[PDB]
């Protein structure tokens, strides 16, 4: 887009010559009695405004790079040139001029010939091995008891990477969560969970009104198990994250399709952790989540008293 | 307060602070998850590993790359990369810092919006901006007109740029880059009696590629020289740490860039894609393009590549054309440096998309302000 700057305002307003120097990421005017005396350690921006019959002005933008100027100075000169052109409705013709190789036109701007002098303003520029974590110390039995007791102090349940949780214990977790009022996050990554676990979790999502986050990554849930989970989504308006990636087997093209169809029938889920294989559903999913997330933005704008 | 610059690529994240001359954090753009080969009690409560730490365990984990061929295709894992970049690598609270992101040429429109949405909804940045990678490289080289060859780990683009802006109809994308080259060197090292076929081996062959490969000026000649002399051969100490030798593989590997058939791709070589890209442009700007060929990205680091490019393009171009290849020593970080300069400019304050402007417009604001 087009940008303002006190010097832009002054640019090309009449026929003549204007010289600015790049000084610490700003465009600074050169005193008119120093015109044509270029610091070889610096970078400059020159605008030649020529007048023509229309009353309209002709514009030629030159950025001059001294041999010892720093990368921030030549980059800024270049960018400021583009910005100045844009501000001038794109009508300037841009010229790169390097010390010792300046164009005849540019050299011609300087009646007495341009000079070089040494120096200038200073640049504006200013392990691990194998999993070293103590294991998940979460107590499976105790925690299940708390979810059953509807324990107010229990909001986060992380059973990640815990060895030998019976499948009936995980199914029990899902059953207890049906009536629990306090657990907002539940994850069971890499606990060897399979379809029975996912089926029970699916039923639970139809009833539970509090769970925000569900993570079942890195288990052995099939496409059928994953499908059943998302088939619960239209009966759910509280879950916002479902992470399902890295199951032991690819879900299958047909399933990916049935899945995005369900994602389009829920306006609440904001994140779906799954890398789609087919591009059709991949983009449908990305768009569905983007749609649902924009609903958050809009109600955040409306609840803004107006 | 200080702005952040994050340059996210297929293989590497480059991140740091606006106003710095170089990125402060460079790490692999990867997320690692356990293999289903038993419960890794060692992971604790973690569901995955990110960046360097996931790399350390590349033998224990299955690694996923949320950016493919320069395009973000896994938005959830990309959230992980970005969280890890802010909180672990740069140690900043993203809601205190304007953030500049980069995107690939020809980035689909929905992706730009999604990037905008995630920065504001998930990270609550106060302001952000998205800039085209190749353009930032051209700006870091002190130019508003030129044709960039950007080659990284996942993708190679030729990006012609005039008076500040890319010419999208002339952009070409070649899905051939440093990871393919690493994989190919693994192969031809295996041809002469060495075992390298993934993980601790893919990463070490990458190091071999970076340290010993080079682009031959005349390829058929270099092959003949290689047979005779031995003056080209060099050796390399493994970590284990046996010592191996390597010869014509030094330049066969990146020859693939000029001869994609070496790995069964039908595509033309990068010299030819550069040419085709210039030829899709207005006649009146082709001279400027030919005279400002700017190399960007890690796969343009091979010694010899600029000369080889100069030679190949001369043979393609009208006889009377001035041709020049620019190959800055810091071109591994050109994109990031260009972003650092841009976000530092006194005119850049008004270019940010602010939280308020996003709140009112939604993410499609990105097509109007980041342009
Ligand atoms: N000295 C070197 N010689 C040859 N190749 C190198 C050298 N240094 C880095 N590379 C390669 O460059 C790649 C990383 O570069 P870069 O950071 O430009 O890629 P990226 O931005 O992650 O990927 P892309 O631009 O493809 O999305 C790797 O494949 C790396 O091995
Ligand atoms: Ca200077
Ligand atoms: Ca112009
Ligand atoms: Ca890149």
From Swiss-Prot, chain A:
Top-level taxon of the source organism: Eukaryota
Compartment annotation: Cytoplasm, Cytoskeleton
Reported tissue expression: Highly expressed in the erythrocyte, heart and skeletal muscle.
GO molecular function, one term: tropomyosin binding
Swiss-Prot/TrEMBL GO biological process terms: actin filament organization; adult locomotory behavior; lens fiber cell development; muscle contraction; myofibril assembly; pointed-end actin filament capping
Keyword DNA-binding attached: no
Major location (coarse): cytoplasm
GO (cellular component) term, any one: membrane
Entry keywords, A to Z: Actin-binding, Cytoplasm, Cytoskeleton
Function: Blocks the elongation and depolymerization of the actin filaments at the pointed end. The Tmod/TM complex contributes to the formation of the short actin protofilament, which in turn defines the geometry of the membrane skeleton. May play an important role in regulating the organization of actin filaments by preferentially binding to a specific tropomyosin isoform at its N-terminus.
Protein family according to the UniProt entry: Belongs to the tropomodulin family.
Complex formation: Binds to the N-terminus of tropomyosin and to actin. Interacts with FLII.
Name this polypeptide is given: Tropomodulin-1
Organism: Homo sapiens
From-to range in the entire protein, with total length: 170 to 349 of 359
UniProtKB/Swiss-Prot annotation, chain B:
Keyword Transcription among record annotations: no
Residues carrying Tele-methylhistidine: 69
Name of the top EC class for this enzyme: hydrolase
N6-malonyllysine PTM sites in chain numbering: 57
Catalytic activity reported: ATP + H2O = ADP + phosphate + H(+)
An example Gene Ontology biological process: skeletal muscle thin filament assembly
Region (Interaction with alpha-actinin): 106-119, 354-366
Family per record: Belongs to the actin family.
Other noteworthy facts: In vertebrates 3 main groups of actin isoforms, alpha, beta and gamma have been identified. The alpha actins are found in muscle tissues and are a major constituent of the contractile apparatus. The beta and gamma actins coexist in most cell types as components of the cytoskeleton and as mediators of internal cell motility.
Annotated protein name in UniProt: Actin, alpha skeletal muscle
Natural source organism: Oryctolagus cuniculus (Rabbit)
Gene name as annotated: ACTA1
């Amino acid at each position: 887009m087009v940008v303002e700057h006190p010097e832009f305002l002054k640019a090309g307003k009449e026929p003549g010559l204007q010289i600015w120097r790049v000084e610490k990421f700003d465009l600074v005017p050169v005193p008119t009695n120093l015109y044509g005396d270029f610091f070889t350690g610096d970078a400059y921006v020159i605008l030649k405004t020529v007048q023509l019959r229309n009353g309209n002005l002709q514009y030629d933008l030159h950025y001059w790079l001294g041999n010892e100027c720093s990368q921030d100075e030549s980059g800024a000169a270049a960018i400021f040139t583009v910005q100045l052109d844009d501000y001038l409705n794109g009508r300037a013709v841009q010229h790169r001029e390097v010390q010792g190789f300046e164009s005849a036109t540019f050299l011609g701007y300087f009646k007495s010939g341009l000079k070089y002098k040494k120096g200038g303003v200073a640049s504006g520029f200013g392990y691990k091995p194998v999993p070293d974590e103590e294991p998940n110390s979460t107590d499976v039995e105790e925690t299940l008891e708390r979810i059953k007791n509807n324990d107010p102090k229990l909001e986060e349940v992380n059973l990640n990477n815990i060895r030998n949780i019976p499948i009936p214990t995980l199914k029990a977790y899902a059953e207890a969560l049906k009536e629990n009022s306090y657990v907002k996050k539940f994850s069971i990554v890499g606990t060897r969970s399979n379809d029975p676990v996912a089926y029970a979790l699916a039923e639970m999502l139809k009833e539970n009104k509090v769970l925000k986050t569900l993570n079942v990554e890195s288990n052995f849930i099939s496409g059928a198990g994953i499908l059943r989970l998302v088939e619960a989504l239209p009966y759910n308006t509280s879950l916002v994250e479902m992470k399902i990636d890295n199951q032991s087997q690819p879900l299958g093209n047909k399933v990916e399709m049935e899945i995005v169809s369900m994602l389009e029938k829920n306006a609440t889920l904001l994140k779906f952790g799954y890398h789609f294989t087919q591009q059709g559903p991949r983009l449908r999913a990305s768009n569905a989540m983007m749609n649902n997330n924009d609903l958050v933005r809009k109600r955040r704008l409306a609840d803004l008293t107006g | 307060t200080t702005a952040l610059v994050c340059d996210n690529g297929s293989g590497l994240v480059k991140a740091g602070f606006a106003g710095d001359d170089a990125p402060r954090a460079v790490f692999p753009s990867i997320v690692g998850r356990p293999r289903h080969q038993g419960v890794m009690v060692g992971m604790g409560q973690k569901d995955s590993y990110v960046g360097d730490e996931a790399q350390s365990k590349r033998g224990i984990l299955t690694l996923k790359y949320p950016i493919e061929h320069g395009i973000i295709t896994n938005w959830d894992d990309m959230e992980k990369i970005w969280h890890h970049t802010f909180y672990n690598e740069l140690r900043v609270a993203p809601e205190e810092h304007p953030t500049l992101l980069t995107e690939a040429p020809l980035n689909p429109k929905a992706n730009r919006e999604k990037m905008t949405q995630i920065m504001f909804e998930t990270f609550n940045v106060p302001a952000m901006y998205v800039a085209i990678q190749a353009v930032l490289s051209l700006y870091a080289s002190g130019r508003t007109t030129g044709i960039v060859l950007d080659s990284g780990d996942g993708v190679t683009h030729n990006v012609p740029i005039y008076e500040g802006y890319a010419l999208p109809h002339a952009i070409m994308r070649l899905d051939l880059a440093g990871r393919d080259l690493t994989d190919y060197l693994m192969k031809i090292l295996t041809e002469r009696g060495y075992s390298f076929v993934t993980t601790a081996e893919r990463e070490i062959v990458r190091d071999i590629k970076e340290k010993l490969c080079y682009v031959a000026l005349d390829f058929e000649n270099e092959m003949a020289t290689a047979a005779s002399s031995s003056s080209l051969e060099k050796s390399y100490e493994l970590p284990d740490g046996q010592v191996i030798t390597i010869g014509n593989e030094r330049f066969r590997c990146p020859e693939t860039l000029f001869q994609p058939s070496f790995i069964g791709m039908e595509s033309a070589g990068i010299h030819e894609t550069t040419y085709n890209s210039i030829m899709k442009c207005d006649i009146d700007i082709r001279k400027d393009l030919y005279a400002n060929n700017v190399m960007s990205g890690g796969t343009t680091m091979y010694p010899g590549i600029a000369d080889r490019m100069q030679k190949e393009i001369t043979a393609l171009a009208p006889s009377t054309m001035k041709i020049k290849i620019i190959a800055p020593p810091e071109r591994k970080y050109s994109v990031w440096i260009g972003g650092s300069i841009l976000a530092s400019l006194s005119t850049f304050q008004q270019m940010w998309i602010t939280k308020q402007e996003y709140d009112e417009a939604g993410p499609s604001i990105v097509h109007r302000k980041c342009f």
